[PDB]
Amino acid sequence: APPIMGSSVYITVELAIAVLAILGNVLVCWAVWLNSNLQNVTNYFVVSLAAADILVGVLAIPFAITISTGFCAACHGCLFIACFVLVLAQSSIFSLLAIAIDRYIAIAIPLRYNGLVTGTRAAGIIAICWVLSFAIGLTPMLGWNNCGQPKEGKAHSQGCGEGQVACLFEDVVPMNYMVYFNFFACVLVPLLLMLGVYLRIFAAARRQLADLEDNWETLNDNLKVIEKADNAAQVKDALTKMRAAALDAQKFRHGFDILVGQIDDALKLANEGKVKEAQAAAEQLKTTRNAYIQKYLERARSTLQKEVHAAKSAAIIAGLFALCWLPLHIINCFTFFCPDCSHAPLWLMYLAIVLSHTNSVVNPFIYAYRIREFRQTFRKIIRSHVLR
Ligand SMILES: CC(C)CCC[C@@H](C)[C@H]1CC[C@H]2[C@@H]3CC=C4C[C@@H](O)CC[C@]4(C)[C@H]3CC[C@]12C
Ligand SMILES: CC(C)CCC[C@@H](C)[C@H]1CC[C@H]2[C@@H]3CC=C4C[C@@H](O)CC[C@]4(C)[C@H]3CC[C@]12C
Ligand SMILES: CC(C)CCC[C@@H](C)[C@H]1CC[C@H]2[C@@H]3CC=C4C[C@@H](O)CC[C@]4(C)[C@H]3CC[C@]12C
Ligand SMILES: CCn1c(=O)c2c(nc(/C=C/c3ccc(OC)c(O)c3)n2C)n(CC)c1=O
Ligand SMILES: CCCCCCCC/C=C\CCCCCCCC(=O)O
Ligand code: NA
Numbered sequence: 001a002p003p004i005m006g007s008s009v010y011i012t013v014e015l016a017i018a019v020l021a022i023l024g025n026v027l028v029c030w031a032v033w034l035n036s037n038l039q040n041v042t043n044y045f046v047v048s049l050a051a052a053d054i055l056v057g058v059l060a061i062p063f064a065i066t067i068s069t070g071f072c073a074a075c076h077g078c079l080f081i082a083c084f085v086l087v088l089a090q091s092s093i094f095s096l097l098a099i100a101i102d103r104y105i106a107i108a109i110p111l112r113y114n115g116l117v118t119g120t121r122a123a124g125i126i127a128i129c130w131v132l133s134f135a136i137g138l139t140p141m142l143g144w145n146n147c148g149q150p151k152e153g154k155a156h157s158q159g160c161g162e163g164q165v166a167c168l169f170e171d172v173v174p175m176n177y178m179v180y181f182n183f184f185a186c187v188l189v190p191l192l193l194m195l196g197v198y199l200r201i202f203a204a205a206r207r208q209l210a211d212l213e214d215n216w217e218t219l220n221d222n223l224k225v226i227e228k229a230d231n232a233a234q235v236k237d238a239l240t241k242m243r244a245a246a247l248d249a250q251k252f253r254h255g256f257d258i259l260v261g262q263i264d265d266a267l268k269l270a271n272e273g274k275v276k277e278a279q280a281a282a283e284q285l286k287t288t289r290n291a292y293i294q295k296y297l298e299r300a301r302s303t304l305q306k307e308v309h310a311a312k313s314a315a316i317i318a319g320l321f322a323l324c325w326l327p328l329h330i331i332n333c334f335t336f337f338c339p340d341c342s343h344a345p346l347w348l349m350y351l352a353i354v355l356s357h358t359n360s361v362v363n364p365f366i367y368a369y370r371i372r373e374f375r376q377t378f379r380k381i382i383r384s385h386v387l388r
Helices: 003-034 041-067 075-108 110-116 119-137 152-157 175-227 232-250 253-271 275-281 284-337 346-370 372-387
Strands: 072-074 164-166
Touching (some): 003 041, 003 346, 041 075, 041 119, 072 075, 075 119, 075 284, 152 164, 175 232, 175 275, 175 284, 232 275, 232 284, 253 275, 346 372
Antiparallel strands (some): 072 164
């Protein structure tokens, strides 16, 4: 079968992906520039990772189409064509790592967050991450390559000029780089870290909710104790547990300013031994509870759920990165570790490459389904500018 008919399917699919990559991720960048509600440190990393996906469509995918022809070229120019995509992939791992650490700080030290994270420091972290991304991804050009042992049978067959090679990924890029250095050290290790960070985020959130609900059950069982109590020694106890629980839940001020004051007064009645005026005084507490602290515990509960919903959106993007990228890394593993195995067939190579490229399309859809601010901003731009 002429190679050119299978080539035409591959190339057509690649071009289709490129257009979706650029369109959807240019829309993300327009939303964030326009809507100031979307201008948070969290979203500057999302614009960084949108940039990487845009350049997959404009550069990486065109590079992949041409490397697959075997065209004659100077070996070091082949390596750049072949490795630029490793730069863009590394950049996305750092952006993904950053968003996880950012969402963890948000949930773990909400007090200090705005102090510790700032948009000026953010831009710094992003620049450094791109420089690093070029460094990791183009390490083969500093000498860790196969340019020094060219396949001159294949150069002469293709009729390349002198000094030229048949430009093929697995010919110029060594497989020990790809498996030990790129996959194990630079992709897989960072991904396991994200797994761990996200584990603590959901753990700290599950345990923050529990602490709220405990303070709520501590506050009302103690209340049942004062109600049908007997001695002033046990009214005291049932009110000491309420004050500690009040101060714990504090970490709006009016509702608590009164509640702790009301405990204080009812306590001194108990201490001078007036039992039943201290009792009766602790039912006016019920009033402050329903009027203030329960609006407090309800809206604190609502906010933790917002933060967890946002952290779950970020985890889905990281998970989809791994899904789309592991097949190629696993095939390379087979290629490198089993020289007794037959090399994966060409049609499977191209499915795995195509699949790693698909990751550049999916993120815009996740924002639109899962984050209402993005979805409404998307709606406003399409209707306002494209369609009307
Ligand atoms: C502003 C953007 C578009 C700049 C992109 C520049 C790109 C397209 C340039 C910069 C380096 C170039 C390569 C440098 C060297 C050679 C070796 C030669 O034997 C074949 C072409 C090849 C492999 C070039 C192809 C095109 C190339 C990759
Ligand atoms: C977190 C998870 C995804 C880590 C990645 C698991 C990888 C490293 C594992 C899972 C399957 C494994 C492969 C399974 C089978 C063989 C055949 C053998 O002749 C050579 C090793 C080789 C090719 C293994 C290499 C390592 C491998 C690719
Ligand atoms: C990341 C998750 C979804 C893993 C997906 C499974 C993929 C990566 C696995 C499952 C079956 C695997 C194949 C099993 C057997 C062979 C035959 C061997 O001669 C070359 C490799 C090849 C062709 C493997 C390539 C990788 C492969 C296609
Ligand atoms: C993510 C990094 N990366 C790769 O690792 C990668 C790759 N292409 C291949 C293999 C191509 C190939 C193999 C054997 C062939 O004939 C026997 C053949 O004709 C082509 N590999 C291994 N690319 C696409 C540009 C890439 O981006
Ligand atoms: C937004 C995507 C824009 C895509 C435009 C460019 C796509 C075409 C890609 C490269 C053309 C192929 C280069 C092949 C060199 C000659 C092959 C040969 O002589 O064997
Ligand atoms: Na990406």
